[PDB]
Amino acid sequence: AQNPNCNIMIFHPTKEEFNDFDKYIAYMESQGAHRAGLAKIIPPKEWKARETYDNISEILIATPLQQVASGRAGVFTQYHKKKKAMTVGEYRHLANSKKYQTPPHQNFEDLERKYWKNRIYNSPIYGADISGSLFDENTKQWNLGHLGTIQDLLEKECGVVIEGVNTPYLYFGMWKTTFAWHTEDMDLYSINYLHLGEPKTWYVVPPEHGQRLERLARELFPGSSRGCGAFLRHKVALISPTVLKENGIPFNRITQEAGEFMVTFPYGYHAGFNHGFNCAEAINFATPRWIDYGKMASQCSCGEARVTFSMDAFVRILQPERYDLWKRGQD
Ligand SMILES: O=C(O)CNC(=O)C(=O)O
Ligand SMILES: [Mg+2]
Ligand code: NI
Ligand SMILES: [Zn+2]
């Protein structure tokens, strides 16, 4: 068995290996990458997502989210308070302000320490989940706006034609902006490209150990657990590496820098934070190996998790027994 310790693997494809996306994902899995739940892909040196980032300031962040924490430093939830619209240029200035900028630090490890010590005492503002793309239409390799769609994958594997579309999303982050512990909708893959700016630190639990994280989460967030049998779908809970280590949960960590891709694998729980002003782009995708994960994915039916139009068909076709109850949650 490849990668039996479930370490995060890092890949350096050549320009030739960068041509066929599906084939490279399957190669990485042949080497055991999926066992970690997360992989890094460093693009060939010849490749670029676009020519420059000089003209992005007029993109609108229609609903910036202020991420307000409750709990203790290592075990907290966050809620998203909606703020007034602002442009990317306005947001970048805000991120760079004395109130919100990254503190002086020695290295990524020191910054990670400061994040876990201090996150809860501040409420950073995140421009998340903005439909759109920063890939140039002429970029033919690993262009997250030109991937094969999940609907087309399900149709190719299962023969059923379904409605729905699959488009990317932009994320504009600042120091301390936080992504809570989650897997993807329907336990899909995700791919994330850090277009610009400061790094993003990731934490991940191997898929084969996801239920260990879930059991710890039900202990640590006991009212949320009683409210919903899949409350990590709410995407609000944080647990620090110190706490994970104290409770024996297997995980790994890695920092993504500008110009790098990360891939999350089916049922790989992940969480993380931004080091400073940055812009990422991400999208879900599927492969044949995903289908069985999609069929087994938990679902939130309490009404909190509220997701896209396109998840309907996935539930309806892969999880017909759950469909009724899940749809009640969506309506
Ligand atoms: O970058 C972020 O804030 C969150 N991204 C992801 O969870 C992802 O790409 O799967
Ligand atoms: Mg612009
Ligand atoms: Ni994710
Ligand atoms: Zn729920």
Nearest Cα residue to 185 out of 9, 70, 319: 319
Cβ(179) – ligand 1 distance below 6 Å: yes
What does this entry list as its resolution, in Å? 1.5
Instruction: For residue 59, give the 3-state DSSP assignment.
Output: coil
Cβ(178) – ligand 1 distance below 6 Å: no
- Ligand nearest to C-alpha 228: 4
For residue 261, the cross-strand partners are 41, 193
158: amino acid identity, one letter: C
Ligand 1 atom with the smallest distance to the CA of 284 is: 10
Give the tokens for residue 11: 């890949």
Largest Cα separation within the chain, whole Å, is: 55
Ligand 1 atom with the smallest distance to the CA of 282 is: 9
CA distance 315 to 290: 14
Q: Report how far apart, in Å, the C-alpha atoms of 22 and of each of 103, 148, 181 are.
A: 40, 9, 27
Sequence ranges of the binding site? 126, 182, 184, 192, 200, 228, 234-235, 270, 300, 302
Sequence ranges of the binding site for Fe cation? 182, 184, 270
Nearest Cα residue to 287 out of 191, 165, 205, 188: 188
Give the tokens for residue 188: 């899909």
Taking CA 65 as the corner, what is the angle to CA 331 and CA 103, rounded to the nearest 5 degrees?
A: 150
Best residue among 78, 134, 190 to mutate for probing ligand 1's pocket (most ligand atoms within 8 Å of CB) is 190
Q: How far is the CA of 92 from the centre of ligand 2 (A)?
A: 13
Spatial neighbors of 240 by CB under 8 A, at least 6 apart, are 73, 74, 75, 116
Nearest Cα residue to 275 out of 177, 169, 172: 177
Give the tokens for residue 213: 């994280």
Q: How far is the CA of 272 from the centre of ligand 3 (A)?
A: 10
Q: How far is the CA of 65 from the centre of ligand 1 (A)?
A: 15
Give the tokens for residue 244: 């994970």
Which is it for strands 200-205 and 125-131: parallel, antiparallel or unpaired? unpaired
Which residue in the block uniquely carries the two structure tokens 């309907």? 312
CA distance 56 to 88: 7
Domains parsed from the chain with CATH numbers: 1-331 (2.60.120.650)
Nearest Cα residue to 305 out of 194, 227, 193: 227
Q: How far is the CA of 185 from the centre of ligand 3 (A)?
A: 9
Beta strands in the chain (DSSP E): 9-11, 38-41, 60-61, 65-72, 75-82, 86-87, 125-131, 169-173, 178-182, 189-197, 200-205, 237-239, 252-256, 261-264, 269-274, 278-285
Spatial neighbors of 178 by CB under 8 A, at least 6 apart, are 67, 78, 119, 124, 126, 238, 271, 272, 273, 274
CA distance 66 to 20: 39
